[PDB]
Write a protein that binds this ligand. Structure first.
Ligand code: K
Ligand code: K
Ligand code: K
Ligand code: K
Lengths: 452, 447
């Protein structure tokens, strides 16, 4: 088949040794920066077609992070690739001990649809930096980006080492029978289990970035003007289709209405009175998810928005008040511009509420109180945490990104991408010279024991 | 069931917050220190009955490593557990950026039989240090240690947080239906796949230390007196039942008989003329494995040893020459005191040979040439490497231990154990103060 041949060619090219020298890896990463500059308008067009993105947010909410990762990894690659001496003991003082980094082999990256350039190419950058071959499986749901990357990736990168696999689930299922040395997947909890199961047949390690509802606890005594503007921004970018968007708010009933008003105000400033007319407001990805998201509004008390247009897959920025934790909107990842507010009486009820559910990819808290921030962190678990902002924590080079529990396993970005797509190999190199100190270890053992 | 109730009690205890303060974790580790000291003869006796270990090798080839791990982790725990600041950008000068370590929850350690104290308790030490509840499943193959641990663990440690699950394969399968937050398994490649498959049903991350044939390449023109004493030590300790034993030898045909003679010489020094009479020589764990290893000698040329005693599961230290790589002794992990020698005509052929096969847990080479060593490393892949010695590299606090590909995934020992059994959580803490610097990100975007 087309699929088996692509993997076969990718493994053969890795076995040929071409990816080992750093010079090669850098050329390929440089070919990706050239891809981003030369294909700028093609990239915008595809995101515009897929998700109603524009020239600005296509770059500054997605493409720029791929470029910054490339530039960063290029400059650090020689340091990261070098053998790493570690601490010696008196018994090993005359030896050399170090960690040797080496590629795993052929890496599979399975992309997703919501940021279809970032979540395909940024993982791929890491895997290329670590000297692996990389097979890419784009999500069909972002149809234009999928077809574009199939076309342009082979124009800039090595053809055998970095193939692109077309199709949907049946192709992905077939692809997953093939033998890989690492699999990174971004998507749903349920497919994450399927992918880990398939990985186990070849004992392949996995990086899984999965689902969850990222909570946003808003403190009673904080500046709600600043809080709600930041919350609104993170929640309603990409029409709410972000993995670390604040899914829902937890707040005291005393401040709920103020939050609604400040969310409304910020939303008006961002997108105007009618968000449908804004260039900067996105659209739901597909008919299936439009119907899914609209379904979550039903039966709820709507404070703002609450309508949608099926023909264009537009959903108005929507805020829900006094939301039942057991209702549909609070029982699945929203991934849409519907912001429910669940009421809690204290920090402690909010912590318990978060802990009774599955561990989220991101945890958010808005507060000026340092002890509230430390307490919430200390008593919960989540992939990453941001206090007094949203989104920005997953873009910083110094902060590895990933889930925990149902939100995922493994991590990447920056140095962690390089580690994730390498095997870190402990090495002990001794002199081959008689050492009396070692003779204590050889049989026969002493006939008389001594104290420890 | 009683397995479900144990796992429930361990999770309820974890969720209480009991394991979070470092003082609690250190008290549990100090209790483990007291256990090792107070139960020394009971441990030796169990290892003697299971594996034919003695007082000396019980401690100096197994128990001591657990003690050193405990002592090292107690001392380093505050530093490791502290929030770790990371590098800022000009865009993030007024923020706090740090990695926060926190327990995973309830960790499962599935032990194995060949080093049944080390490979059950040393992982448990790391998981305790990370603030997890730890459920323990010892291997039934080492029956005496299994029983001992079931009795003495609860006598010294928290009874809810750190339960011991008895039984064999059915009970392990039953245990694998329970939801854990991490599984560490040491054992076989085949069962490793079964573990990972069960873990996927709860999306549980795994540390798998599995099998392989750890190659031992012996260079021409190197000091074979020294090399062969070292190879023989690693190969034949614990009657060859070590994960990183030098499984087989690759050597130039011109030094095959020198290697044979040096191995003999060392074997006689270690274990005398009749190894069956040596207090320092072990026995095979079970009838099944005794027959399996004796079977591997069949069809092979015996340069030394080649006899066995079924009743006590003794197999003489055995050297095999001019071995066909397609023969059974070269198609499975040996895990016994049978050392085959496979001839190769060049360093390059040895690299191809190793690369052609599955990635081994360890790779060994013996050479006085630094370039040889570096080349073999650069062009192969294994879990770990030692040049000019065997075994020793998996005992060092500064060298993470673990496999790659068929020899496994993840790693532990030392600081890496703490990381493995914790979640490392990225934290950004910004001021809640109006910032004109951020305003460019908000819509409307400019033209
Ligand atoms: K390095
Ligand atoms: K000695
Ligand atoms: K032969
Ligand atoms: K603006």
């Amino acid at each position: 088949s087309k699929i088996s041949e692509a993997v076969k060619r990718a493994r053969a090219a890795f076995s040929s040794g071409r990816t080992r020298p750093l010079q090669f890896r850098i050329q390929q990463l440089e070919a990706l920066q050239r891809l981003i500059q030369e294909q700028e308008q093609e990239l915008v067009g595809a995101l515009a077609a897929d998700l109603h993105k524009n020239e600005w947010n296509a770059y500054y909410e997605e493409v720029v992070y791929v470029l910054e990762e490339i530039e960063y990894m290029i400059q650090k690659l020689p340091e990261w690739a070098a053998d790493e001496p570690v601490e010696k003991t008196p018994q090993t003082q005359q030896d050399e001990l170090y960690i040797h980094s080496e590629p795993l082999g052929v890496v599979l990256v399975i992309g997703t649809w919501n940021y279809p350039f970032n979540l395909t190419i940024q993982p791929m950058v890491g895997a290329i930096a670590a000297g692996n071959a990389v097979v890419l499986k784009p999500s069909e749901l972002s149809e234009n980006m999928a077809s574009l990357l199939a076309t342009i990736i082979p124009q800039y990168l090595d053809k055998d080492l970095y193939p692109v696999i077309n199709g949907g689930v049946p192709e992905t299922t077939e692809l997953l029978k093939e033998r890989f040395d690492h699999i990174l997947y971004t998507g749903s909890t349920g497919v994450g289990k399927i992918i880990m199961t398939a990985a186990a047949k070849h004992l392949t390690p996995v990086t899984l970035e999965l689902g969850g509802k990222s909570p946003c606890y808003v403190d009673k005594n904080c500046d709600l003007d600043v809080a709600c503007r930041r919350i609104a921004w993170g929640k309603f970018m990409n029409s709410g289709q972000t993995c670390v968007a604040p899914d829902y708010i937890l707040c005291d009933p005393s401040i709920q209405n103020q939050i609604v008003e400040k969310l409304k105000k910020s939303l008006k400033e961002f997108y105007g009175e009618d968000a449908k007319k804004s260039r900067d407001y996105g659209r739901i990805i597909s008919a299936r998810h439009f119907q899914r998201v609209m379904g979550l509004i039903e039966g709820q008390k709507v404070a703002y928005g609450g309508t949608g247009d099926a023909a264009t897959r537009y959903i108005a920025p929507t805020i829900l008040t006094d939301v039942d934790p057991q209702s549909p909107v609070m029982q699945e990842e929203i991934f849409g511009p519907v912001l429910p507010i669940v009421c809690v009486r204290s920090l402690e009820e909010a912590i318990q509420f978060i802990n009774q559910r599955e561990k989220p990819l991101a945890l958010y808290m808005f507060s000026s109180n340092d002890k509230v921030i430390k307490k919430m962190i200390a008593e919960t678990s989540s992939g990453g945490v941001a206090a007094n902002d949203v989104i920005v924590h997953i873009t910083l080079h110094s902060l590895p990104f990933g889930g925990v529990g149902n939100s995922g396993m493994g991590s990447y970005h920056g140095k962690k991408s390089f580690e994730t797509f390498s095997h870190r190999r402990s090495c002990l190199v001794r002199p081959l010279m008689n050492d009396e100190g070692l003779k204590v270890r050889y049989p026969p053992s002493p006939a008389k024991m001594t104290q420890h």
